[PDB]
Symmetry: C3
Subunit: 582 residues, 3 copies
Amino acid sequence: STVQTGINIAGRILGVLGVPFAGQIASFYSFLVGELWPRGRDPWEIFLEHVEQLIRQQVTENTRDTALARLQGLGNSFRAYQQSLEDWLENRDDARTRSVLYTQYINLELDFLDAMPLFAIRNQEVPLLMVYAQAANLHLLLLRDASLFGSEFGLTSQEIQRYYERQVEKTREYSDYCARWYNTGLNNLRGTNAESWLRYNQFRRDLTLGVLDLVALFPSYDTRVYPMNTSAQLTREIYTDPIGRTNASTNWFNNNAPSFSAIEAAVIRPPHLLDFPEQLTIFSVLSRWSNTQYMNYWVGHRLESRTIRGSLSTSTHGNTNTSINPVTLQFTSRDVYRTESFAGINILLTTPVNGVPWARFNWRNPLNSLRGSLLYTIGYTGVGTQLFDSETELPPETTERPNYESYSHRLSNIRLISGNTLRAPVYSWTHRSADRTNTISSDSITQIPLVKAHTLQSGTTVVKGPGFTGGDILRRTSGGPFAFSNVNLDFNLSQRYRARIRYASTTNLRIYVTVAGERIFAGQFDKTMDAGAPLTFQSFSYATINTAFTFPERSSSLTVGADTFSSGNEVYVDRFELIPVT
Amino acid sequence: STVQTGINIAGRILGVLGVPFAGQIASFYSFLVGELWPRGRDPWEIFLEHVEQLIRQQVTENTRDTALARLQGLGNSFRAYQQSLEDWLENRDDARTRSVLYTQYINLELDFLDAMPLFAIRNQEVPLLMVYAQAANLHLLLLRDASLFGSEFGLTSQEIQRYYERQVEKTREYSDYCARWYNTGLNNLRGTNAESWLRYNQFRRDLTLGVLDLVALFPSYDTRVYPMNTSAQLTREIYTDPIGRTNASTNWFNNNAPSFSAIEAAVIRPPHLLDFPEQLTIFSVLSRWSNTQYMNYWVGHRLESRTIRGSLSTSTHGNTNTSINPVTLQFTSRDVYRTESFAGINILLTTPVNGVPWARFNWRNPLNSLRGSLLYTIGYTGVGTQLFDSETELPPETTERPNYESYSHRLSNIRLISGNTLRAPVYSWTHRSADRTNTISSDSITQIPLVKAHTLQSGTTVVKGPGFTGGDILRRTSGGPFAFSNVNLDFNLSQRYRARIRYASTTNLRIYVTVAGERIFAGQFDKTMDAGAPLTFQSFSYATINTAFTFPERSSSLTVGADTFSSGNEVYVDRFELIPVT
Amino acid sequence: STVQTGINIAGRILGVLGVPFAGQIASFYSFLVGELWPRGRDPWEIFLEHVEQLIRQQVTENTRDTALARLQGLGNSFRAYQQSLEDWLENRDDARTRSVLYTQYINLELDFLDAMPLFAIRNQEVPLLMVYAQAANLHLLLLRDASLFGSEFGLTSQEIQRYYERQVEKTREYSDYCARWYNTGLNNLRGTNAESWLRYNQFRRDLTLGVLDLVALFPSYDTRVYPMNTSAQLTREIYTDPIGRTNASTNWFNNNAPSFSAIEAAVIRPPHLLDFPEQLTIFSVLSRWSNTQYMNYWVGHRLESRTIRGSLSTSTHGNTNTSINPVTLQFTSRDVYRTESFAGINILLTTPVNGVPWARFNWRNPLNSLRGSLLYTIGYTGVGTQLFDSETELPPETTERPNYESYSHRLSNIRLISGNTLRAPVYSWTHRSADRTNTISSDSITQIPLVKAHTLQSGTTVVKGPGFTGGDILRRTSGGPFAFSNVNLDFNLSQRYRARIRYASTTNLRIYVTVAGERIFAGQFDKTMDAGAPLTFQSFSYATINTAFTFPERSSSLTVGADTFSSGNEVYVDRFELIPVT
């Protein structure tokens, strides 16, 4: 539910980024009070106690009362502001409505200022992280409304500016707090054994859904950088729990093997370029004690993964001996949105075996409404069984449609935890907003993270993301191209686009873009951080190249690079954006 | 003092219900800051520590600081708002006064929103109940001012509505919280012995004075339901402490007898129709040890009680043997407002006897300024003595007049706690606002609770009140009349009145009224709750019958009924109101 | 730093008292957010933990979170208000800027009301004293801005008055809280030995710098009493730590002697009239153990001190035998702003000796830019050494100039703690704002405390200050003159001035002033307190004598007196002010 709501909120903000036209602010605001201040329950205390249970450290009974009391009162005010904001909809002229809405806006904007430190208490920053992050986003949307149509509210140009300036610094402040405190929180649960890793990974996945995916949208509220509609991609991989037992007491981590440090390096893919799974091939082994107690469980797999117009990559995990047949499932261009998995446990004299004898992959074709299940199993009986529904961990956002139209995540990679007499698959997922084609729209600002590329230049490493960008990030230490991406355009192609790239660098440099590997458009831009400085939100600037360009084909490719600086300096690239000039 | 203030506040709100004309809001508001934010002391912490001592459970030193700090700051703001509200009195046109008063109104209305959860902390809801309830009333009066003359403030029709809507839902929210939490609080002090019953009853009486009597006036703030002046009656019975010893260690509850469960069923009258005492007859027994240590104490009484135009009822308690003479006092139509009682204790070898050898009943005639004492005693000497002044528990409201003009309660019933060698009278009182004649005014809305009736139909039970109505309530389970009341009208009788009755029902039904048991005016009205649902504030609606009527005599009688529904459903009636049409 | 900031703030308010013209409010406000809400650190928690360490009693981890969270949010709002206040600078006409600035002013003024009890928690009033006092001043400056130019904001005359009234009562409320709680705090650290006295004196000096010097400026915010520029003097003496050891464990207080009660009476000058040091003569004694371990340390001194046009006074402390030579330093009319002192420790078999073998007095001439050091030493080697820089305790205010132009305090008196084999000088200092000439300006209101006089009448005692005036105070118990002062005027002398004197009295009386001991101007004024009442902020009123006068000479003398009342009553005088009539 905690996770369910963070998905609904973050996924619905994706639709209302930059400048919205007409009346999606009010319906979004209306949706927002319904999800955040509902009848019946308090989702804030659900946030607070969700993280508290994760890190296994309860807030003081004090800090509890203070924040939630501040939160509901703020919700009475947020409900009041939107209520009247929902009446300004029809209003064109009134010296009283724009005078009360005036005051309740200003009061609540002010109210969020005082309230923000309340959810930011020393020694209990981490338990309040989701509570804090969801509140921080709320304040940043309201400052966006100052720029949006406060100009009609009865606000002066100077006060709009004063409002925009705090939105800028609050975007920097809120994006830093969440990143560091998500990191510190994650840091403390670093353990020494597997049981601590499950708690570690759980903290990572759940808070990535609520907090980090919201923070990554904060830059896209800026009215001046995104003066129209803009589109964003969240590119991080998240890992659902490994499919193993949990009851009655060996389980799956006390069934021998590996260490915390071993599991973390074995399942977490190092920072890569984003790929979609293609063909999956499962190998099985049979482990019986008699005619009534056997099960052929999951021992190894071979998964093909392709970047966007990439050459095929195939990884191998586990065992591959094929006395038993191997079953192969087909995932290419099909969104595996829901996996129902069964964790089997067979027992010998003292030694129990954990494996997976059944896993169904529900898939949808995002381009043309084709569904399907893909089943793996051989046979089993007399063994223990524990279900793993992916939607327990990765629910579709709450919609008026079924799950195969409303899902929020795809299967992207299957790793495998192996040991002596233990097999625990781990599904890594990628967010829906990260698309398969890098489609470039004609009437909105398309953000394409450089992580959506297919090829790295001979010196470009993908380094792990700071927290507040939505995914990992690419870093050159000397001049040259960064990565090679492929982009697709819609019906009418005559469109000219200017290029703008979110970068972080130690030096003034020349940033360029080449289309179809032939014609080039460059610019000169500024240093954004100090040499030993540790990459915060303000280290990132936008480098707008003046000159517009036409794409030659509906399927063209775009390179991003930066040279003309002395090596040893560090240059980062998060994202190239394409601004349709019109 | 805690109790003294709850009386002053609640009693003074009685005069300013519905729509006030001219300038009683400001003087009431001025009175309100004087009583709530005085110089010298903090009555909020007096509230808080009064309940804390009752339930014998102190708030955390934390929750203490938070709420009182919020409260005084709110009082600095409430003092500021009223200060300028007290200057708008003279103002007719000003774009600045109605612009500051504008802002400090809106700010404080908003301020109460955030503040309300502060006085509503989990695990300490009951100790803050009076603190909470008095604050809740404060917020609800200000929302009433939005409807009242915010229309002149510079408020638009839509924002007045938005203000009225929160007044509606806050009236529902605040009336539910107080009722349930008064009930939960009362529930925990349910004990097993008599010493726990005194603490139990003390909690009941004191919090009924401050909280419940205030909540019962919350419906009467609605500007649309009561668009003029309206009159309200509080009909509950409250029970002062039984007159027994308290020092040096047997006292009156360790002098043997009964249990908690025994006392509660023996003294608390089950839900009845309200009656006023008539003739009281005391019986006494003499208990001496010698010539220097005797006392004839109170052993039994016989009290006559009449409903409004009711047949005489006489109850009997205790002993009645009349070797000693019996003394009879006359209370008919006389408001016993003050009782000074003496708890006597005589001692034998080990067995002590508790009784009352002296009790004076100060009375006033509410129609024509006749006072008087009525004394009971026989003779006593050498025995212990402990005074019981009713005004210690039931003080008159703070006025510029003496107690026999400013009293807030009347004696209504005398029960008696009996045991082996123990006599402890208990005085039950009814609030002043509940009148003796059910007078119906020509220019205000007269609320007559159905508990002010004289006769029940053959299936109507008086069930115990939910908490937020002011008294108990009447319930039919099949169609027919509810109860039979008698009403009185003032000088000019030509007036036509329409009837409107606060009801709660499971089904659509026909609600009617008949005047003088002859002519009938009915209507059809809506279901208001679900079958198993537990009767909250929103279960109660108003059923307005369209047709006006003339009363035939200055002393007429009015029946309330509801038929045309299937039995097994439940129908409740709290109150019939009479709206003078003009 | 805590002390460093209290100096900067208080010293910079001295320049912007009463009514400022043009644009020093905004630059002062800009300075104020920089010093109070800086980047990097939280000076509020530095305040809070500074006092906490002094009294050796930490706030609860709770009260901590609450106040600082309220404080920064208030700082986000204070930064916002000043930000737009810093834009109204250029604005002359706008129905929107004066409408947002409108609302954020009113909101923050309201915000300070609720916030003030937050920093005033029961059982932790003293640790929050500096936090509280600095916040109290902030609120009082904003109320001053209501009177100043709220009249242009869009405020009505009546609301300005309502704003001024709270400024009056808040000036009374904040000045009382700080004085009593500074006193209670100081009271608890009353000890029995010398180690407790150092902690006692430390609490006195540090909180006098931050809190008391700020409170003494609160009266000078009143727009009606000081309708122009006004000048104020802070006249209290503060005492830096006695120069003794602190490491490795005898130190200087365990090296035998005296008690708490002995030290307090020996070093703290009883309430006197303010004097400036003149000629200082140090006597030394030699204490060696061999040729490699000797030191001639400070044993006694003889200091000349003169009031303003006073006869010379000379005090003597310590020893005076002159086998060793005596060194004499010249301080007359020279501001000893910085002293660097060395605490020496020589050791015998078990008995160690503490003395001072080196002390340099940096001085500046305030009239004409002459600097200089004045050194005392004889010779020392092989002994322990611990430096005492006065700016560790008494820093110059943070400026763009060096310390000999920006210092905040002068050396005024040197007392000496003596014992058997122990010498610990103690420097008493007077604040810079207290001047040497009592200069009277032509275009500002000059406050001259009566403590700046030179002669007391035959019945006038200087009694210790209540806390909220800036220094001690003079009290007559029968009619007559109070004290005799000398005043100096600037270039053009034609000016007429009216006299007004801050007094506190039990009776209606005649207060007079005589110039040059010849011509007299008197008036009749009102009782201000009750006979046994204990002198609070409201005990002090201003007695304005109607008639203007001319001073005859550039160096004239002014007497203040009050007769025509019955003896036994008490009459206090803090300050005579001189209002240039024009």
